[PDB]
Amino acid sequence: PPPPPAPQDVEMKEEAATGGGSTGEADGKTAAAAAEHSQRELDTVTLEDIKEHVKQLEKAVSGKEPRFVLRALRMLPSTSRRLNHYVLYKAVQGFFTSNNATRDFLLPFLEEPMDTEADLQFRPRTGKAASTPLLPEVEAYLQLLVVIFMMNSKRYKEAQKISDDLMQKISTQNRRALDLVAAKCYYYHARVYEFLDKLDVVRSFLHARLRTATLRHDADGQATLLNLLLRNYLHYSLYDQAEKLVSKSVFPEQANNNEWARYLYYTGRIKAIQLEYSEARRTMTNALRKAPQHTAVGFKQTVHKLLIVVELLLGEIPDRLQFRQPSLKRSLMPYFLLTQAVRTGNLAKFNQVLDQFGEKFQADGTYTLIIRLRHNVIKTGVRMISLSYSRISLADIAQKLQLDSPEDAEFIVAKAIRDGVIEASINHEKGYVQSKEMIDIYSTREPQLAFHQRISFCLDIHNMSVKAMRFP
Amino acid sequence: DLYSRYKKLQQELEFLEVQEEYIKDEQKNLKK
Amino acid sequence: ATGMYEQLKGEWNRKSPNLSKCGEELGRLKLVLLELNFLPTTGTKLTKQQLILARDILEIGAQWSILRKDIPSFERYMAQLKCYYFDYKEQLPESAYMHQLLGLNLLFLLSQNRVAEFHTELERLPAKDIQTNVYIKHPVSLEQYLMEGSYNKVFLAKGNIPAESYTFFIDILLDTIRDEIAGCIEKAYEKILFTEATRILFFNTPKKMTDYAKKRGWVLGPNNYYSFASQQQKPEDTTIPSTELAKQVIEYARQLEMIV
Amino acid sequence: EDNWDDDNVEDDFSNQLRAELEKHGYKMETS
Amino acid sequence: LRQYYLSKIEELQLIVNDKSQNLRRLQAQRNE
Amino acid sequence: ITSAAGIISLLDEDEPQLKEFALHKLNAVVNDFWAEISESVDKIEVLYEDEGFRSRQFAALVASKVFYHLGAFEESLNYALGAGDLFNVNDNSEYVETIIAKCIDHYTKQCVENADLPEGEKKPIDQRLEGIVNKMFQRCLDDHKYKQAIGIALETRR
């Protein structure tokens, strides 16, 4: 009896205030494209995942559903009668019995905010009402003989988007929330389609909703639909990466600084798999630092596990565990064991490391490191030599890299220059590889080019800041 | 009434620009 | 199985490069493309097995096309073979006549100086290709050798191919390797002599001596390699974008002076 | 900081190695 | 056909709403 | 879904019976992808370039299929009556829904630019476009609502 009533209060009041203020903002002002309660949906990314998972069988949350699905609200007297009915639909939990809507009363409850003479002028209340059945069901994480019910509720949510496409779409811009809803549902729905085979019908309606946007509206929905396309495009990533790069989808722009990070991660892996490493490293580092708000959120453990993989494919050697965290130090242990081998030149120990932990490397989604990595087993070494010796000979490099034949030792140099690892040139009168130095970085108009972009971005921050201001 | 809805929307759109042009003149001169 | 369904292969038993069968081969292509379906290939597993048969005879048609020295028709036909090897309902049994011919597709992809399509192509076999694919070990390890200094071993392994010859991509590989070497080093080095590029680029003095003597600049033959030097002058002014700089600085004042 | 903060080197062979070189053939016959 | 004549006034109403939201900030600055 | 260039290779195999094969499978390759033909646009332009191709008009449809996503609108603006044909024949579709609004705004801005210069040649209305404009004017008259037609004829100032 102490566990029930306080969730019954705070988890009545947060969403009562959210629904009331969302309807009041979306109708009182027409400029509610980015309302205050939009951040409330950000709270719903983090609230209900730790607030309640099951319907709280000690008479707490099972009564929240039939009250919040009984909404008629014709005018002010019907809404006031709903406020009067709130006391009884509140006390029915704590006094007698919360009704057992045990994982099934979500399908005939679609017409429940149409029963008892309901009018639907606020579409986002129906969007939140279609968002609610995933709270005791897909946020309970069971996935046992239950899949068809979330697919049915998602078809009802699709019918809600058809209602947003056909029934009174007079500049409501509710899709700017609904696509965010089509974020969260179609996350775990994706997990459902992760459990079964390829999501071809999801591919078709994802493309259809991707081109349903842009011409209609464009704010943070097309980015989410693009990313939800591209993740399972990258699942069976066979030849569609050329399609994804020729997919003109750099549009995203504002993405609350979180979705843009994983979009950068996805296109970084696409560009990393196609031998272009130097362009991949900068966008990998950009995606790593874009949203590091919390430590080891799963995303960091994977972008950090791709980052110095592509950096070791480039040739530069950082140590991996320099951000020792609760789930960084012990999760990157064979990662550190592999990155210790590239500084050395032992191939047998590296092969023993790979054969010892090849199952974990296949678990990381990084099958194809080895098919290129042996090239860097020589290449990194010669760049270190090209960093150490400004003028190296032709015969000393044979014993400085244990490359046996002097012609074989002097042939990697005939590739590393051409793709570009070292400025040095070779001449066949001495057999000496020698490089020059750069002094003109500050002497020429190199700093002005970077400074113009920095100045433009910094001064435009002031304009964007002042453009959102005082609202008396 | 959809023709009247379109043209009144087109009327206020090109009329909101003359308010946004006249205020930026007034806010500039009020500094001086 | 609408009307054709012929006897295994029409002409394959004796020496293959003959032009007699090809037209009816073309007719067989007609008798596979307007029958039920070829692109979705959803149901009717007998038509899928007929598509497998057409795939095998189209592999023999690719053999015939490279036997008559035809690259665009062959690349079109292989491309259709790659289209046919995956189905929308993947139920088709693997025919054994790909484990010596898919590596020919990989060798063609390598020999068309394509490395991006190589590495994005290497996702069909997740972990299968390491144990089996013994003839197909050569096209996938040729990428590994290319990123190594095994070039002399590559020209020695030009004739070590285990199962069957299909020598055409091996010679196109030779041509592209010599072309990449010859067009890749002409600006880092300065001079070459008779010994400083024969065993380094060409061979150990091969019949292609004259072929490399007439290829491009830096001609060789009279006891030293001379003529057609290649370097740079690098002229610069660097004060040309100053007017552009003016634009930039005025814009700065522009952002400083329009009322927010 | 544990015991060595970060970085360092794991060659496991440099322990007064110049003194070993001086001991290596008597400093290469005192070159 | 007709739904084109709806969607055009939808876009025009979005532009009108955005400009009317932007004007009130300048009105407040002028008032101050 | 990876045929793409492989099927377009057979779609442009150089044989007249293979051109009959091309017109057979060209309505069979109607899909929502306008990517993976973006690298083969000129290829389908070949199927629009052939005057000896009997189904060039149907080729117009796939010539309008390649640009409906890669941002482009002016190509489908061109391919409305000069290529046109069976695309504008279609009654109800979301694929043509943006196209008809594009053509209506193009027609009204061209009518503005023509009626603003009454003296002399004023870059006159082309012969191949207005065919869809009067078609859906009569469709609007056939939609039983004879109240928007006067507005549409008022916006296109003629």
PDB file of C-alpha atoms in Angstrom, chain C:
ATOM      1  CA  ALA C   1       8.653 -24.653 -68.598  1.00  0.00           C
ATOM      2  CA  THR C   2       6.485 -23.060 -71.278  1.00  0.00           C
ATOM      3  CA  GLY C   3       7.836 -24.398 -74.568  1.00  0.00           C
ATOM      4  CA  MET C   4      11.661 -24.663 -74.791  1.00  0.00           C
ATOM      5  CA  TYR C   5      13.110 -26.932 -72.071  1.00  0.00           C
ATOM      6  CA  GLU C   6      15.957 -28.233 -74.240  1.00  0.00           C
ATOM      7  CA  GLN C   7      18.431 -31.058 -73.639  1.00  0.00           C
ATOM      8  CA  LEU C   8      20.923 -29.868 -70.963  1.00  0.00           C
ATOM      9  CA  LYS C   9      23.236 -27.833 -73.216  1.00  0.00           C
ATOM     10  CA  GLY C  10      22.979 -27.533 -76.985  1.00  0.00           C
ATOM     11  CA  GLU C  11      26.645 -27.292 -78.007  1.00  0.00           C
ATOM     12  CA  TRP C  12      29.165 -27.570 -75.176  1.00  0.00           C
ATOM     13  CA  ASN C  13      30.790 -31.025 -75.434  1.00  0.00           C
ATOM     14  CA  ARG C  14      33.375 -30.365 -78.155  1.00  0.00           C
ATOM     15  CA  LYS C  15      35.381 -27.082 -78.585  1.00  0.00           C
ATOM     16  CA  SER C  16      33.183 -24.219 -77.335  1.00  0.00           C
ATOM     17  CA  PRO C  17      33.953 -21.075 -79.512  1.00  0.00           C
ATOM     18  CA  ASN C  18      31.411 -21.620 -82.289  1.00  0.00           C
ATOM     19  CA  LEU C  19      28.863 -19.088 -83.506  1.00  0.00           C
ATOM     20  CA  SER C  20      26.176 -21.613 -84.511  1.00  0.00           C
ATOM     21  CA  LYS C  21      24.306 -22.019 -81.221  1.00  0.00           C
ATOM     22  CA  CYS C  22      24.403 -18.352 -80.093  1.00  0.00           C
ATOM     23  CA  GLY C  23      21.325 -17.165 -81.993  1.00  0.00           C
ATOM     24  CA  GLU C  24      19.194 -19.957 -80.588  1.00  0.00           C
ATOM     25  CA  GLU C  25      20.904 -19.136 -77.293  1.00  0.00           C
ATOM     26  CA  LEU C  26      19.486 -15.683 -77.947  1.00  0.00           C
ATOM     27  CA  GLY C  27      16.206 -17.439 -78.711  1.00  0.00           C
ATOM     28  CA  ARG C  28      16.496 -19.274 -75.392  1.00  0.00           C
ATOM     29  CA  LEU C  29      16.947 -15.858 -73.782  1.00  0.00           C
ATOM     30  CA  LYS C  30      13.667 -14.821 -75.423  1.00  0.00           C
ATOM     31  CA  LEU C  31      12.159 -18.074 -74.222  1.00  0.00           C
ATOM     32  CA  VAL C  32      13.121 -17.161 -70.654  1.00  0.00           C
ATOM     33  CA  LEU C  33      12.127 -13.484 -70.546  1.00  0.00           C
ATOM     34  CA  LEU C  34       8.512 -13.322 -71.810  1.00  0.00           C
ATOM     35  CA  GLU C  35       7.299 -16.556 -70.224  1.00  0.00           C
ATOM     36  CA  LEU C  36       6.099 -15.935 -66.662  1.00  0.00           C
ATOM     37  CA  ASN C  37       8.466 -13.438 -64.935  1.00  0.00           C
ATOM     38  CA  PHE C  38      12.215 -12.945 -64.551  1.00  0.00           C
ATOM     39  CA  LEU C  39      12.813  -9.933 -62.295  1.00  0.00           C
ATOM     40  CA  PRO C  40      10.614 -10.574 -59.167  1.00  0.00           C
ATOM     41  CA  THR C  41      10.599 -14.394 -59.484  1.00  0.00           C
ATOM     42  CA  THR C  42       8.221 -14.818 -56.558  1.00  0.00           C
ATOM     43  CA  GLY C  43       6.581 -18.236 -56.864  1.00  0.00           C
ATOM     44  CA  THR C  44       6.601 -21.179 -59.316  1.00  0.00           C
ATOM     45  CA  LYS C  45       9.801 -22.922 -58.214  1.00  0.00           C
ATOM     46  CA  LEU C  46      10.030 -24.814 -61.522  1.00  0.00           C
ATOM     47  CA  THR C  47      10.497 -21.457 -63.264  1.00  0.00           C
ATOM     48  CA  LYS C  48      13.130 -20.614 -60.645  1.00  0.00           C
ATOM     49  CA  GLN C  49      14.970 -23.832 -61.514  1.00  0.00           C
ATOM     50  CA  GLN C  50      14.573 -22.860 -65.173  1.00  0.00           C
ATOM     51  CA  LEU C  51      16.137 -19.519 -64.215  1.00  0.00           C
ATOM     52  CA  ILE C  52      18.989 -21.484 -62.598  1.00  0.00           C
ATOM     53  CA  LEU C  53      19.412 -23.432 -65.851  1.00  0.00           C
ATOM     54  CA  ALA C  54      19.357 -20.183 -67.846  1.00  0.00           C
ATOM     55  CA  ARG C  55      21.926 -18.784 -65.402  1.00  0.00           C
ATOM     56  CA  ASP C  56      24.248 -21.747 -66.003  1.00  0.00           C
ATOM     57  CA  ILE C  57      23.870 -21.555 -69.784  1.00  0.00           C
ATOM     58  CA  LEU C  58      24.385 -17.786 -69.524  1.00  0.00           C
ATOM     59  CA  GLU C  59      27.615 -18.531 -67.655  1.00  0.00           C
ATOM     60  CA  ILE C  60      28.568 -20.669 -70.658  1.00  0.00           C
ATOM     61  CA  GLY C  61      27.469 -17.728 -72.814  1.00  0.00           C
ATOM     62  CA  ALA C  62      29.841 -15.500 -70.849  1.00  0.00           C
ATOM     63  CA  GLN C  63      32.518 -18.129 -71.524  1.00  0.00           C
ATOM     64  CA  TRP C  64      31.619 -17.898 -75.210  1.00  0.00           C
ATOM     65  CA  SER C  65      31.631 -14.090 -75.153  1.00  0.00           C
ATOM     66  CA  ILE C  66      35.095 -13.904 -73.640  1.00  0.00           C
ATOM     67  CA  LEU C  67      36.161 -16.617 -76.093  1.00  0.00           C
ATOM     68  CA  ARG C  68      35.129 -14.245 -78.904  1.00  0.00           C
ATOM     69  CA  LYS C  69      36.799 -11.246 -77.150  1.00  0.00           C
ATOM     70  CA  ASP C  70      33.645  -9.352 -76.152  1.00  0.00           C
ATOM     71  CA  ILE C  71      33.795  -7.193 -73.004  1.00  0.00           C
ATOM     72  CA  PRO C  72      30.501  -5.081 -73.029  1.00  0.00           C
ATOM     73  CA  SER C  73      28.218  -8.019 -73.790  1.00  0.00           C
ATOM     74  CA  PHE C  74      30.038 -10.077 -71.153  1.00  0.00           C
ATOM     75  CA  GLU C  75      29.747  -7.402 -68.468  1.00  0.00           C
ATOM     76  CA  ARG C  76      26.048  -6.970 -69.295  1.00  0.00           C
ATOM     77  CA  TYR C  77      25.518 -10.723 -69.067  1.00  0.00           C
ATOM     78  CA  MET C  78      27.491 -11.170 -65.813  1.00  0.00           C
ATOM     79  CA  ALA C  79      25.554  -8.213 -64.355  1.00  0.00           C
ATOM     80  CA  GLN C  80      22.370 -10.102 -65.204  1.00  0.00           C
ATOM     81  CA  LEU C  81      23.948 -13.210 -63.626  1.00  0.00           C
ATOM     82  CA  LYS C  82      24.526 -11.248 -60.413  1.00  0.00           C
ATOM     83  CA  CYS C  83      20.908 -10.080 -60.678  1.00  0.00           C
ATOM     84  CA  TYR C  84      19.791 -13.698 -61.037  1.00  0.00           C
ATOM     85  CA  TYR C  85      21.973 -15.188 -58.289  1.00  0.00           C
ATOM     86  CA  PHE C  86      19.954 -13.344 -55.647  1.00  0.00           C
ATOM     87  CA  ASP C  87      16.194 -13.863 -55.662  1.00  0.00           C
ATOM     88  CA  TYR C  88      13.370 -12.031 -53.925  1.00  0.00           C
ATOM     89  CA  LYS C  89      12.501 -15.405 -52.384  1.00  0.00           C
ATOM     90  CA  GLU C  90      15.942 -16.902 -51.759  1.00  0.00           C
ATOM     91  CA  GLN C  91      15.157 -20.612 -52.056  1.00  0.00           C
ATOM     92  CA  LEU C  92      17.246 -21.499 -55.130  1.00  0.00           C
ATOM     93  CA  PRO C  93      19.879 -24.235 -54.699  1.00  0.00           C
ATOM     94  CA  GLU C  94      23.469 -23.211 -55.316  1.00  0.00           C
ATOM     95  CA  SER C  95      24.715 -24.660 -58.584  1.00  0.00           C
ATOM     96  CA  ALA C  96      28.294 -25.917 -58.368  1.00  0.00           C
ATOM     97  CA  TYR C  97      29.352 -23.955 -61.478  1.00  0.00           C
ATOM     98  CA  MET C  98      29.920 -20.650 -59.692  1.00  0.00           C
ATOM     99  CA  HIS C  99      32.895 -21.630 -57.403  1.00  0.00           C
ATOM    100  CA  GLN C 100      35.189 -21.280 -60.393  1.00  0.00           C
ATOM    101  CA  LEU C 101      33.314 -18.460 -62.192  1.00  0.00           C
ATOM    102  CA  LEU C 102      32.331 -15.995 -59.449  1.00  0.00           C
ATOM    103  CA  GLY C 103      36.051 -15.447 -58.948  1.00  0.00           C
ATOM    104  CA  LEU C 104      36.183 -14.489 -62.608  1.00  0.00           C
ATOM    105  CA  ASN C 105      33.631 -11.779 -61.791  1.00  0.00           C
ATOM    106  CA  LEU C 106      35.856 -10.690 -58.894  1.00  0.00           C
ATOM    107  CA  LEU C 107      38.882 -10.700 -61.215  1.00  0.00           C
ATOM    108  CA  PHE C 108      36.974  -8.564 -63.725  1.00  0.00           C
ATOM    109  CA  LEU C 109      36.041  -6.129 -60.949  1.00  0.00           C
ATOM    110  CA  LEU C 110      39.698  -5.941 -59.938  1.00  0.00           C
ATOM    111  CA  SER C 111      40.820  -5.585 -63.565  1.00  0.00           C
ATOM    112  CA  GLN C 112      38.439  -2.690 -64.268  1.00  0.00           C
ATOM    113  CA  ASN C 113      40.568  -0.712 -61.722  1.00  0.00           C
ATOM    114  CA  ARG C 114      37.630  -0.870 -59.306  1.00  0.00           C
ATOM    115  CA  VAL C 115      38.533  -1.284 -55.648  1.00  0.00           C
ATOM    116  CA  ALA C 116      35.433   0.310 -54.085  1.00  0.00           C
ATOM    117  CA  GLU C 117      33.093  -2.106 -55.861  1.00  0.00           C
ATOM    118  CA  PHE C 118      35.446  -4.902 -54.773  1.00  0.00           C
ATOM    119  CA  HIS C 119      35.186  -4.085 -51.081  1.00  0.00           C
ATOM    120  CA  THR C 120      31.476  -3.298 -51.100  1.00  0.00           C
ATOM    121  CA  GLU C 121      31.053  -6.478 -53.158  1.00  0.00           C
ATOM    122  CA  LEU C 122      32.743  -8.497 -50.402  1.00  0.00           C
ATOM    123  CA  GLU C 123      29.618  -8.866 -48.260  1.00  0.00           C
ATOM    124  CA  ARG C 124      27.933 -11.811 -50.020  1.00  0.00           C
ATOM    125  CA  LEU C 125      29.851 -14.478 -48.108  1.00  0.00           C
ATOM    126  CA  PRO C 126      29.891 -13.648 -44.364  1.00  0.00           C
ATOM    127  CA  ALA C 127      32.385 -16.298 -43.274  1.00  0.00           C
ATOM    128  CA  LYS C 128      32.130 -18.876 -46.074  1.00  0.00           C
ATOM    129  CA  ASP C 129      34.975 -17.644 -48.292  1.00  0.00           C
ATOM    130  CA  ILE C 130      37.850 -18.580 -45.961  1.00  0.00           C
ATOM    131  CA  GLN C 131      37.511 -22.378 -45.839  1.00  0.00           C
ATOM    132  CA  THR C 132      36.141 -23.084 -49.337  1.00  0.00           C
ATOM    133  CA  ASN C 133      36.584 -20.915 -52.475  1.00  0.00           C
ATOM    134  CA  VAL C 134      39.986 -22.453 -53.220  1.00  0.00           C
ATOM    135  CA  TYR C 135      40.064 -21.232 -56.817  1.00  0.00           C
ATOM    136  CA  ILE C 136      38.343 -18.042 -55.604  1.00  0.00           C
ATOM    137  CA  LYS C 137      41.128 -17.549 -53.061  1.00  0.00           C
ATOM    138  CA  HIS C 138      43.216 -16.089 -55.896  1.00  0.00           C
ATOM    139  CA  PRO C 139      40.970 -13.043 -56.737  1.00  0.00           C
ATOM    140  CA  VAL C 140      40.420 -12.162 -53.063  1.00  0.00           C
ATOM    141  CA  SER C 141      44.097 -12.640 -52.096  1.00  0.00           C
ATOM    142  CA  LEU C 142      45.135 -10.656 -55.166  1.00  0.00           C
ATOM    143  CA  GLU C 143      43.815  -7.566 -53.377  1.00  0.00           C
ATOM    144  CA  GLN C 144      46.001  -8.542 -50.416  1.00  0.00           C
ATOM    145  CA  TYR C 145      49.022  -8.948 -52.693  1.00  0.00           C
ATOM    146  CA  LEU C 146      48.266  -5.678 -54.522  1.00  0.00           C
ATOM    147  CA  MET C 147      48.552  -3.833 -51.180  1.00  0.00           C
ATOM    148  CA  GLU C 148      51.915  -5.584 -50.733  1.00  0.00           C
ATOM    149  CA  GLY C 149      55.181  -5.658 -52.660  1.00  0.00           C
ATOM    150  CA  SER C 150      54.407  -9.110 -54.059  1.00  0.00           C
ATOM    151  CA  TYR C 151      54.354  -7.726 -57.620  1.00  0.00           C
ATOM    152  CA  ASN C 152      57.098 -10.073 -58.827  1.00  0.00           C
ATOM    153  CA  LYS C 153      55.235 -12.900 -57.101  1.00  0.00           C
ATOM    154  CA  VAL C 154      52.055 -11.627 -58.803  1.00  0.00           C
ATOM    155  CA  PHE C 155      53.692 -12.010 -62.218  1.00  0.00           C
ATOM    156  CA  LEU C 156      54.971 -15.422 -61.113  1.00  0.00           C
ATOM    157  CA  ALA C 157      51.432 -16.358 -59.978  1.00  0.00           C
ATOM    158  CA  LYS C 158      50.088 -15.185 -63.349  1.00  0.00           C
ATOM    159  CA  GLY C 159      50.155 -18.878 -64.339  1.00  0.00           C
ATOM    160  CA  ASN C 160      49.512 -20.848 -61.128  1.00  0.00           C
ATOM    161  CA  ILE C 161      45.679 -20.800 -61.360  1.00  0.00           C
ATOM    162  CA  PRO C 162      44.469 -24.185 -60.025  1.00  0.00           C
ATOM    163  CA  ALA C 163      41.216 -25.379 -61.585  1.00  0.00           C
ATOM    164  CA  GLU C 164      40.687 -23.850 -65.049  1.00  0.00           C
ATOM    165  CA  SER C 165      42.481 -21.253 -67.145  1.00  0.00           C
ATOM    166  CA  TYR C 166      40.125 -18.378 -68.145  1.00  0.00           C
ATOM    167  CA  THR C 167      43.380 -16.544 -68.888  1.00  0.00           C
ATOM    168  CA  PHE C 168      41.729 -13.270 -70.133  1.00  0.00           C
ATOM    169  CA  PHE C 169      41.315 -11.456 -66.806  1.00  0.00           C
ATOM    170  CA  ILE C 170      44.804 -12.615 -65.834  1.00  0.00           C
ATOM    171  CA  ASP C 171      46.222 -10.782 -68.856  1.00  0.00           C
ATOM    172  CA  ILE C 172      43.933  -7.774 -68.279  1.00  0.00           C
ATOM    173  CA  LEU C 173      45.235  -7.822 -64.689  1.00  0.00           C
ATOM    174  CA  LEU C 174      48.759  -7.791 -66.147  1.00  0.00           C
ATOM    175  CA  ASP C 175      47.840  -4.890 -68.460  1.00  0.00           C
ATOM    176  CA  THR C 176      46.245  -2.858 -65.673  1.00  0.00           C
ATOM    177  CA  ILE C 177      49.133  -3.495 -63.271  1.00  0.00           C
ATOM    178  CA  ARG C 178      51.693  -2.299 -65.835  1.00  0.00           C
ATOM    179  CA  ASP C 179      49.448   0.656 -66.722  1.00  0.00           C
ATOM    180  CA  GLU C 180      49.002   1.615 -63.058  1.00  0.00           C
ATOM    181  CA  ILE C 181      52.750   1.366 -62.436  1.00  0.00           C
ATOM    182  CA  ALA C 182      53.664   3.287 -65.610  1.00  0.00           C
ATOM    183  CA  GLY C 183      51.126   6.054 -64.997  1.00  0.00           C
ATOM    184  CA  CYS C 184      51.666   6.090 -61.228  1.00  0.00           C
ATOM    185  CA  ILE C 185      55.376   6.924 -61.067  1.00  0.00           C
ATOM    186  CA  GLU C 186      56.218   9.822 -63.365  1.00  0.00           C
ATOM    187  CA  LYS C 187      56.482  12.736 -60.891  1.00  0.00           C
ATOM    188  CA  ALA C 188      58.268  11.482 -57.743  1.00  0.00           C
ATOM    189  CA  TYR C 189      61.293   9.966 -59.472  1.00  0.00           C
ATOM    190  CA  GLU C 190      63.427  12.040 -61.822  1.00  0.00           C
ATOM    191  CA  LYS C 191      65.380   9.765 -64.174  1.00  0.00           C
ATOM    192  CA  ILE C 192      65.521   6.125 -65.198  1.00  0.00           C
ATOM    193  CA  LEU C 193      68.217   4.088 -66.923  1.00  0.00           C
ATOM    194  CA  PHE C 194      68.178   0.715 -68.694  1.00  0.00           C
ATOM    195  CA  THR C 195      68.447  -1.163 -65.382  1.00  0.00           C
ATOM    196  CA  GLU C 196      66.560   1.369 -63.240  1.00  0.00           C
ATOM    197  CA  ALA C 197      63.127   0.605 -64.696  1.00  0.00           C
ATOM    198  CA  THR C 198      63.260  -2.643 -66.756  1.00  0.00           C
ATOM    199  CA  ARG C 199      63.245  -5.014 -63.774  1.00  0.00           C
ATOM    200  CA  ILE C 200      61.354  -2.396 -61.748  1.00  0.00           C
ATOM    201  CA  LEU C 201      58.394  -1.949 -64.098  1.00  0.00           C
ATOM    202  CA  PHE C 202      58.557  -4.178 -67.156  1.00  0.00           C
ATOM    203  CA  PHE C 203      60.104  -7.675 -66.737  1.00  0.00           C
ATOM    204  CA  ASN C 204      63.663  -9.106 -66.892  1.00  0.00           C
ATOM    205  CA  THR C 205      63.934  -7.640 -70.456  1.00  0.00           C
ATOM    206  CA  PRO C 206      60.779  -9.013 -72.256  1.00  0.00           C
ATOM    207  CA  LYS C 207      59.518  -8.954 -75.872  1.00  0.00           C
ATOM    208  CA  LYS C 208      57.484  -5.883 -74.706  1.00  0.00           C
ATOM    209  CA  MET C 209      60.721  -3.903 -74.747  1.00  0.00           C
ATOM    210  CA  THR C 210      59.594  -2.183 -77.958  1.00  0.00           C
ATOM    211  CA  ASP C 211      56.069  -1.875 -76.534  1.00  0.00           C
ATOM    212  CA  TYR C 212      57.444   0.039 -73.585  1.00  0.00           C
ATOM    213  CA  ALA C 213      59.813   1.934 -75.861  1.00  0.00           C
ATOM    214  CA  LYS C 214      56.855   3.452 -77.759  1.00  0.00           C
ATOM    215  CA  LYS C 215      54.329   3.781 -74.918  1.00  0.00           C
ATOM    216  CA  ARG C 216      54.768   7.305 -73.544  1.00  0.00           C
ATOM    217  CA  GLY C 217      57.440   9.797 -72.500  1.00  0.00           C
ATOM    218  CA  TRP C 218      60.844   8.722 -71.199  1.00  0.00           C
ATOM    219  CA  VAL C 219      61.735   6.546 -74.175  1.00  0.00           C
ATOM    220  CA  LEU C 220      64.451   3.886 -73.598  1.00  0.00           C
ATOM    221  CA  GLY C 221      66.859   1.709 -75.625  1.00  0.00           C
ATOM    222  CA  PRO C 222      70.289   3.306 -76.322  1.00  0.00           C
ATOM    223  CA  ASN C 223      72.157   2.267 -73.123  1.00  0.00           C
ATOM    224  CA  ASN C 224      70.265   4.878 -71.035  1.00  0.00           C
ATOM    225  CA  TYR C 225      66.681   6.069 -70.775  1.00  0.00           C
ATOM    226  CA  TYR C 226      66.461   9.723 -71.790  1.00  0.00           C
ATOM    227  CA  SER C 227      64.033  12.309 -73.276  1.00  0.00           C
ATOM    228  CA  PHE C 228      60.683  13.768 -72.087  1.00  0.00           C
ATOM    229  CA  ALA C 229      61.518  15.032 -68.617  1.00  0.00           C
ATOM    230  CA  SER C 230      58.655  15.902 -66.279  1.00  0.00           C
ATOM    231  CA  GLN C 231      58.700  18.558 -63.527  1.00  0.00           C
ATOM    232  CA  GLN C 232      56.876  21.724 -62.447  1.00  0.00           C
ATOM    233  CA  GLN C 233      57.441  25.494 -62.365  1.00  0.00           C
ATOM    234  CA  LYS C 234      54.777  26.626 -59.803  1.00  0.00           C
ATOM    235  CA  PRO C 235      53.899  30.248 -60.678  1.00  0.00           C
ATOM    236  CA  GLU C 236      51.888  32.266 -58.181  1.00  0.00           C
ATOM    237  CA  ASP C 237      50.611  35.752 -57.382  1.00  0.00           C
ATOM    238  CA  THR C 238      48.370  34.986 -54.339  1.00  0.00           C
ATOM    239  CA  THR C 239      47.042  38.568 -54.070  1.00  0.00           C
ATOM    240  CA  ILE C 240      44.340  37.921 -56.701  1.00  0.00           C
ATOM    241  CA  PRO C 241      41.532  37.086 -54.137  1.00  0.00           C
ATOM    242  CA  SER C 242      42.002  40.476 -52.439  1.00  0.00           C
ATOM    243  CA  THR C 243      38.832  41.794 -54.102  1.00  0.00           C
ATOM    244  CA  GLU C 244      37.192  38.605 -52.804  1.00  0.00           C
ATOM    245  CA  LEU C 245      38.582  39.493 -49.361  1.00  0.00           C
ATOM    246  CA  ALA C 246      36.846  42.871 -49.676  1.00  0.00           C
ATOM    247  CA  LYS C 247      33.552  41.058 -50.239  1.00  0.00           C
ATOM    248  CA  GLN C 248      34.159  39.021 -47.096  1.00  0.00           C
ATOM    249  CA  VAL C 249      34.948  41.979 -44.885  1.00  0.00           C
ATOM    250  CA  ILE C 250      31.989  44.004 -46.139  1.00  0.00           C
ATOM    251  CA  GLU C 251      29.701  41.058 -45.434  1.00  0.00           C
ATOM    252  CA  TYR C 252      31.101  41.054 -41.870  1.00  0.00           C
ATOM    253  CA  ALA C 253      29.935  44.639 -41.469  1.00  0.00           C
ATOM    254  CA  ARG C 254      26.679  43.541 -43.105  1.00  0.00           C
ATOM    255  CA  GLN C 255      26.075  41.081 -40.274  1.00  0.00           C
ATOM    256  CA  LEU C 256      27.082  43.789 -37.827  1.00  0.00           C
ATOM    257  CA  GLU C 257      24.639  46.372 -39.144  1.00  0.00           C
ATOM    258  CA  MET C 258      21.262  45.020 -40.220  1.00  0.00           C
ATOM    259  CA  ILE C 259      18.817  45.295 -37.345  1.00  0.00           C
ATOM    260  CA  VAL C 260      18.034  41.902 -35.817  1.00  0.00           C
TER     261      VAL C 260
END
